[PDB]
Amino acid sequence: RRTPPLGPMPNSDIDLSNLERLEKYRSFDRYRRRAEQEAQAPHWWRTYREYFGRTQQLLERKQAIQELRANVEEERAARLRTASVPLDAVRAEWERTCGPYHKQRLAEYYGLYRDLFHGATFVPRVPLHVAYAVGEDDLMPVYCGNEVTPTEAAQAPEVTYEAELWTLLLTSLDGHLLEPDAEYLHWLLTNIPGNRVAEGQVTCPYLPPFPARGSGIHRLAFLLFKQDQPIDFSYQLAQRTFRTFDFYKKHQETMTPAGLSFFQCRWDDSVTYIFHQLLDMREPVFEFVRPPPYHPKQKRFPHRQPLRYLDRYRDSHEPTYGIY
Amino acid sequence: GRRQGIKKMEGHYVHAGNIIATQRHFRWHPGAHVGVGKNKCLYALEEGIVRYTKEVYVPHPRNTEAVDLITRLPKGAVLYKTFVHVVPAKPEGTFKLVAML
Amino acid sequence: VENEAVAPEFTNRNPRNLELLSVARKERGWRTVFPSREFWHRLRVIRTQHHVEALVEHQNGKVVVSASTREWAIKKHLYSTRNVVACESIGRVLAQRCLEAGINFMVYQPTPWEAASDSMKRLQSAMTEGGVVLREPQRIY
Amino acid sequence: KNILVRMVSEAGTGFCFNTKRNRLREKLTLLHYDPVVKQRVLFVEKKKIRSL
Amino acid sequence: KARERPQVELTFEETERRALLLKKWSLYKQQERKMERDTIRA
RNA sequence: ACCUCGGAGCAGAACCCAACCUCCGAGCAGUACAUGCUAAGACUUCACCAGUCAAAGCGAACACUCAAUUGAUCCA
RNA sequence: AGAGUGUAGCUUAACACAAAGCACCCAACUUACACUUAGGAGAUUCAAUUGACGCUCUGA
Ligand SMILES: [Mg+2]
Ligand SMILES: [Mg+2]
Ligand SMILES: [Mg+2]
């Protein structure tokens, strides 16, 4: 009993009478490469994936490359394996070109889009700089994926973006204690005249991040939206409860997302203070519990089982005396 | 009469430790969350559902004879083997409130 | 107190939550084949006749961060994109990208000859001095 | 051609293990774990138990 | 043995010269092989 | 000549099953010296006795290869 | 003189963040080859979808 294949069977196309004439892999790497190519390709049989799933610009760049290739000193250094590339410069001009798409990839991986906009994706075109000032000299940056302690995020951060109205919103997606889907609002500055952020209307006062102890890592996202024309908007936790999806839906017409910057935070000492005097509540504490270990149904006669078998099914290790 | 074979077919719930298949030779290769014993027997590393799939076979580079076979294949050729997987059914754990401090 | 209203079971939707707590599952099987799937994150390096690319990829196959000589950012300061110093520059820049992405731990799984190569050794050195460990913490059961 | 011999440790005394040795070879000195001192210590051959 | 000339020390400008020669040679041989390929195809 | 163990004809495809016969082989060996300790869950030569695999953990390091290569109780 | 046209050898690679991926050559190991390592050279025929410079077939 045989059933014909439901599609092209692999290795069928290359199957020839003459095999000596055909070129072969001579290296492990060549086969490997072709293997990943096949793995990524869709298949009619059951797979692992199923179950576990400008002209002027070009000319200018070419000219620059030619000029860079012209020098002898750089070539010498390259040969000597001493040549270095400045990280500051490359970062600066990377943020301009290939920045937004990489940020999009990060946001996609962290699943911000699915939680915020219910699957909808946007490219964070405008560069956004958020920094939490610590002391009078130091400042902790907020990149995409960075981890910042709530102690450092106690005060409102400095927001700078080189652009010419705007709005910004900081949201904690997993911060919510009651409703899993819902998020906590932190601070929503609306109608921001250009780069200058101080002039903006304070819809909601700043509240520092409060991830509960033993609740794991919490992600907080700053979302910057471009505003076409002015529009009217609108310590208790209930008031802070919001969904970004609904808010954006109702403000879709006059307001579109432009920038994204997200950081991570664990519980810290400052969170206790946030809970105590600011929220005027007892601090919730969580712990990671695992499901109870599986044991098969106890038998009257455990055969060829060690003595310790019985200890698997007893609740208390202290001795019992029954009626006596 | 060694009684070797598949013990758990596709769609069967397994617990960690459960022996999926005894084989003598590598008929079924270990896939996701499936351990392999000394005797070449396959066992579940996780509690879940057993799946059988066809996956592209890339041997370890140190495995001399397999690499030799690979390097003798034509340019379009890829090798496939049967693989046993366990799709885990339960999450690692949950966070629950213990103290309203 | 309406503030003192908490769910009995806390829900955290962060994809990186359990990984950072080191309680997330890794794919422990695949012993017969190469490479291992037992990682949360992987450094994967593609060597081409014209370009070198280094990638940080999750187990699920989603890409996190990348350093490619194909990009103008790295091109503009490189004499040639196919050498040891190209790899070293890619190493340093990827380390910077990883730090800002918050990824501190990944595994690198080379072929023996690739490991023996000085270029990849210097890439690994760039990883180390970059602040990225090329060994992942063992998960907690 | 092989003999089973007893190996006794210099430290953590009273612990010994049996190992097989080529008959024509010299007396074995090994470095083996001792549970009494909870560390790897030197062991010497005392006598041949049997011939296998 | 190798007591004939154990010492082998050269300058830096000669290394630069060598590198340039090898680069030029690579280009030249590529061009020559191209000529060969063209003529055989023809 | 044979009596125990492993392989093929030999169940064409889960397991098991071809008595008698026709052939082959085994009764070792080599490398370690954590070939330490402990412990979920399982397999099993159709019983039992035997036999097999193994997560996690403690302690180390940065549960060997081989188809069989074997022997209960008593007793010394 | 007409027709067919057009990316380094190849590719209905190029939505874009980009001229990409295999081919090719030199040096080391190899008697060699192959692998690996270490380096090198490479292109959208020109001007505004259109017109004319290169290529192949048809006239003497
Ligand atoms: Mg039985
Ligand atoms: Mg029988
Ligand atoms: Mg273990």
Curated annotation (Swiss-Prot), chain A:
Record's keyword terms, sorted: Coiled coil, Mitochondrion, Ribonucleoprotein, Ribosomal protein, Transit peptide
Gene Ontology CC: cytosol; mitochondrial inner membrane; mitochondrial large ribosomal subunit; mitochondrion
InterPro entries: PEBP, PEBP-like_sf, PEBP_euk
Annotated signal sequence range: none
Gene Ontology BP annotations: mitochondrial translation
Pfam families with a match to the protein in the record: PBP
Keyword DNA repair: no
UniProt subcellular location: Mitochondrion
Any coiled-coil regions, as ranges: 54-82
Annotated PANTHER family: LARGE RIBOSOMAL SUBUNIT PROTEIN ML38, PHOSPHATIDYLETHANOLAMINE-BINDING PROTEIN
Family: Belongs to the phosphatidylethanolamine-binding protein family. Mitochondrion-specific ribosomal protein mL38 subfamily.
Assembly and oligomerization: Component of the mitochondrial large ribosomal subunit (mt-LSU). Mature mammalian 55S mitochondrial ribosomes consist of a small (28S) and a large (39S) subunit. The 28S small subunit contains a 12S ribosomal RNA (12S mt-rRNA) and 30 different proteins. The 39S large subunit contains a 16S rRNA (16S mt-rRNA), a copy of mitochondrial valine transfer RNA (mt-tRNA(Val)), which plays an integral structural role, and 52 different proteins. mL38 is located at the central protuberance.
Protein name per Swiss-Prot or TrEMBL: Large ribosomal subunit protein mL38
Organism: Homo sapiens
Gene that this polypeptide is encoded by: MRPL38
From Swiss-Prot, chain B:
Regions annotated as coiled coil: none
GO biological process, one term: translation
One GO molecular-function entry: RNA binding
Location relative to the cell: Mitochondrion
Cellular component terms (Gene Ontology): mitochondrial inner membrane; mitochondrial large ribosomal subunit; mitochondrion
UniProtKB keywords: Mitochondrion, Ribonucleoprotein, Ribosomal protein, Transit peptide
Recorded family membership: Belongs to the bacterial ribosomal protein bL27 family.
Assembly mode: Component of the mitochondrial large ribosomal subunit (mt-LSU). Mature mammalian 55S mitochondrial ribosomes consist of a small (28S) and a large (39S) subunit. The 28S small subunit contains a 12S ribosomal RNA (12S mt-rRNA) and 30 different proteins. The 39S large subunit contains a 16S rRNA (16S mt-rRNA), a copy of mitochondrial valine transfer RNA (mt-tRNA(Val)), which plays an integral structural role, and 52 different proteins.
Name the record gives this protein: Large ribosomal subunit protein bL27m
Gene expressing this chain: MRPL27
Residues of the full protein shown: 48 to 148 of 148
From Swiss-Prot, chain D:
GO process annotations (BP): mitochondrial translation
Record's subcellular location: Mitochondrion
UniProt KW Mitochondrion keyword: yes
Keyword annotations: Mitochondrion, Ribonucleoprotein, Ribosomal protein, Transit peptide
Residue pairs linked by disulfide bridges in the UniProt entry: none
GO CC annotations on file: mitochondrial inner membrane; mitochondrial large ribosomal subunit; mitochondrion
Chief location: mitochondrion
GO molecular function ontology, one term from the record: structural constituent of ribosome
Assembly with partners or alone: Component of the mitochondrial large ribosomal subunit (mt-LSU). Mature mammalian 55S mitochondrial ribosomes consist of a small (28S) and a large (39S) subunit. The 28S small subunit contains a 12S ribosomal RNA (12S mt-rRNA) and 30 different proteins. The 39S large subunit contains a 16S rRNA (16S mt-rRNA), a copy of mitochondrial valine transfer RNA (mt-tRNA(Val)), which plays an integral structural role, and 52 different proteins.
Family named by the database record: Belongs to the bacterial ribosomal protein bL33 family.
Name assigned to this protein: Large ribosomal subunit protein bL33m
Native source species: Homo sapiens (Human)
Gene name, Swiss-Prot/TrEMBL: MRPL33
From Swiss-Prot, chain E:
Tissue: Ubiquitous.
Transmembrane segments annotated in the record for this chain: none
Recorded superkingdom: Eukaryota
Subcellular location: Mitochondrion
Family: Belongs to the mitochondrion-specific ribosomal protein mL40 family.
Subunit and interaction comment: Component of the mitochondrial large ribosomal subunit (mt-LSU). Mature mammalian 55S mitochondrial ribosomes consist of a small (28S) and a large (39S) subunit. The 28S small subunit contains a 12S ribosomal RNA (12S mt-rRNA) and 30 different proteins. The 39S large subunit contains a 16S rRNA (16S mt-rRNA), a copy of mitochondrial valine transfer RNA (mt-tRNA(Val)), which plays an integral structural role, and 52 different proteins. mL40 binds to the major groove of the anticodon stem of mt-tRNA(Val) in the central protuberance.
Protein name stated in the entry: Large ribosomal subunit protein mL40
